[PDB]
């Protein structure tokens, strides 16, 4: 054999496949978090490719890596690891959306309280060895050579908007309503004398009931996280068509 | 005459710097970014979207919406020059006019006019323009444009707002402050009707 | 079979071919994390 | 006190073409069209359109709120 | 309002239940008929999937007996009634409980 | 009412019109079709030809997108089976 | 009010039922059902013909292909045309 | 108000209605009903006079005058027909 | 007013003031014009006799063709009442 | 009560109607109609002359040279000059 | 409103288990029956998987005794209608004690 063929090959077989897992990583809710240092995620790249490289089938040959098209290879690696991670981190900023709508309207960080929740519903529930699961299968029904993010996975990943919009809305509707409704009664019980008013006065209350309401947020959120981790897994599995 | 391997590999790293660059001066991306910032805005959440996502659909967004010009690029540049059938000159250049095509469907003439008289140059086509005056016009329009989208965008949540301050001030309670009532009326208004949707088809579908 | 010379070509190709790999990888994602970081 | 009652009342009836009305004007003020859009007169005009269709129910819901307080 | 995911499955795949109940009661052998379905999830995160499964118990006429035919016919509708869970995974029991299909 | 449960009415949609057509059919009294498993109470007397129970899974299978022919069973009051599944 | 899936099925049915009474004028029969299954687009065509009569292989033809070209896809071989009696017109 | 997908569907109905009136003045026609698919298809049904059978010549003129009433659905993409079944177009 | 709703509102405006013009020829009793947005078609009740001749209904093609902006020539199709085909499309 | 479009039209409304009764005070005509379409622009004119009399080759290209001047756009070779007899006297 | 996914489960248990003893109470040997199950847990690791069981209590009729047909046949009906369950975990015993089916 000559010898050019061996190590390009393991290289090729390695780094493609290293990428998309990195990638993915980098845009993850856990992994790709500030806490963690760079080599640290570094080091786990490279460690989970080598541990799930029997499973990873082999790369075409056809594909110089010191050419245009291995150029567009490791382009297309990385926009399908983003695609995951992205997902994972429209999770997290919906509850988010959760917290700060419950804030907002609670005459009021509290987004904090709920995206660190919902972090730990993502570690307690095993969401990081799905995400791990679900790059490693899409090696199998996506592989690395032919195959890319056509159109409709960017238009479908471009609507998640108002998937958060909607799902923040669900999970905060009868709170939000609880919140309106005890206020305008605040306001029409009051109403009577103009003297008291609320301003600072409403500020105290508002937020009293507000953070109670949360209280009750906190009891039933997980329901909520379990349909919507549904949700957001079918989707992937829709981007790495499996 | 053709560039060698040494420097078509040069002009090819020198690209992916100015990548980022590409993206908000010459595609899609700033247009979006805007009109999501006026619906962020329009809203009364301040950051509650976040930096991140909003960022991150309009670069899905745009991928979605440069998929025919990227694709034409593939076909027409990178397919000969892949197989050897053109040298690098004519791949870039190749390259370069779908570019300078999506660029002007997306812009005015009162701007490139504004523009070409600016550089003090002498054209009579705006087909043959250079794309160093092309930018700044196809910017100055896309800005102009997602004003005028979020200036629409706008006026449905203005409308909400002002119904509900003065249903509360002709109750009575001038106590009140409209915002926190108004709130869960516009989110609920923005779901039920899929408020995202029909701003994906509007924004999408506005470059044709 | 093989000579130092297939060996030497061998080993240039490979290092030729890693580095490129990994710059263009390091080149996307700082343009990446460009984008991220952003006034939106 | 009877003011904001009589309003929630008309808030039963009245307030569901309400808020067919503001369903309207946000289904119709998202879905633009690009002649629409590069054209600002055309914006002008919806954007008149949409303010006068609300004032007339609006202004039936107000009308009930200030009919009952004289009452 | 106010049933989640889970619950809402169920209410799907016992109404089916009563529905297909209700298509062996037309049959002139069975007089009254209930079906036990068992349908795990896809779960494509584990490797192995215990496999769904039917077990059908019907209250019959006074008389009657079925040989091999009106069983099989029985077991090839319900199994083609519901997605997926093959027709050898039905078990069928009657009064008497004398063994009509394996699963 | 949201997603699942449209769906599943748009399913009983197909049920109902599919059952009301075939009840023009001069030998079947009654249809019931599960979304498929297909269940018919004839006339009083008779027994369908193949090429009724032919004509029946072929217009079964041309009303659903999906239910490839072969998928089909047919069922009747006497519980003869006419196709497999 | 009426959702998206609603209005599609009203607008199939909608478009079912036009087309059975443009079917209605026909000579030979007297009265049809039109099914449609839009996502390969399907189509079931059932009609009851006057008190005799078979229709022949253009008749049925005519009726199939008129079908076909009404609704979007659905190519000419993807509709089955059937009757009360039971006796098969057309494959699919 | 006004649905998106109700007033396009409104837009075909207007447009069939209209050609019905037009082919009402034809001597050999009674009676026409068009059935319109936008991707385009056509499928049109007619009711003629009490006996005749329409030539040739007067089914193409009628067929290119609807391809090019509406835009796209070339002239071949329509399929005409009449009470007792006789195709004039292949679709 | 809605968009789609103007634009099919000034076609019907120019399709009548097209008809009403057309109706000064001797030749012809009663026209209706249909557009296609690009095509034309233009289905005429006519007199009580004579016949249009090439040059007659190449005019009438032309004129049409020349009110609205493109749908070059080669694509109006007429008819009359006996509906006898006068232009390919 | 007024719009974009709409005003646009009645512009060239205005302009149709000037344009004919600049074109009534021709000896040979009596009664003139103008059709505009600005966006390549184009027009068409239809005349009823006198009882009878026929309009020379220099009436019509003074007619049609009056037409294209008076508009923007559509140059004196895009314009359909037709007459009550429907003698065509210019392409487009 | 507000239940644990756990009591979700156990709530569904309930429900699938009546059904099951009512299934069981039109057998003309059987009078009553109670029912009882055992949820899995699906470890890859061989140590630590359980897999899922069932215990049936039957009260007979006054007298009669079961054969062994009969037992299979309530076995089986058993184990097809709840996913896994595989007939070898079945404990089934009767009113005087007796032995039927091991676990």
Redesign the interface.
Known sequence: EYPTSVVLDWIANYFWPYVRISSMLMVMTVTGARFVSPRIRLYLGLAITFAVMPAIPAVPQDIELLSFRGFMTIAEQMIIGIAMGMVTQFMIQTFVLLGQILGMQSSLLLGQLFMFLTTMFFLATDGHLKMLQLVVFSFKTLPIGSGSLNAVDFREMAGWLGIMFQTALSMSLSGIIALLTINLSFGVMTRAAPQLNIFSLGFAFALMVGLLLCWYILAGLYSHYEMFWTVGEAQICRLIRL | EDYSVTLQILA??TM??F??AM??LMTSFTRI?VV??IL?QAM??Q???????????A???T??VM?PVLNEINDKA?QP??NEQVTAREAFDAAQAPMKAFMLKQTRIKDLETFVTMSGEQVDNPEDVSMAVLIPAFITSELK?AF??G???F??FL??DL?VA??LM???????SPM??S??FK????????????????L???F? | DVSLSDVMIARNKSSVAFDATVQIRNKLVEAYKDLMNMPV | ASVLIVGAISLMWFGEALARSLFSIMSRLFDLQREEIFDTAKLFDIALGAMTDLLFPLFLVLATLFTAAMI | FGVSQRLEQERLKLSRERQLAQAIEEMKQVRKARVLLALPKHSVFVRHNQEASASVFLTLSTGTNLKQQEVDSIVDMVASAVPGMKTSRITVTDQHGRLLSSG
């Open positions: 090819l790293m992916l710097g990548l980022p993206v908000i970014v999501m910032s962020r009364g959440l950051q509650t979207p976040s930096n991140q996502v909003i960022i991150g659909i670069l899905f967004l991928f979605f998929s990178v020059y892949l444009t005028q989208i200036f629409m965008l006026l449905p409308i909400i119904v003065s249903v002709a109750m009575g309670m001038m106590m009140l926190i009532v709130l869960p989110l609920m208004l923005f779901v039920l009707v899929d408020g995202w949707n029909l701003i994906l088809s509007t999408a579908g506005s044709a």
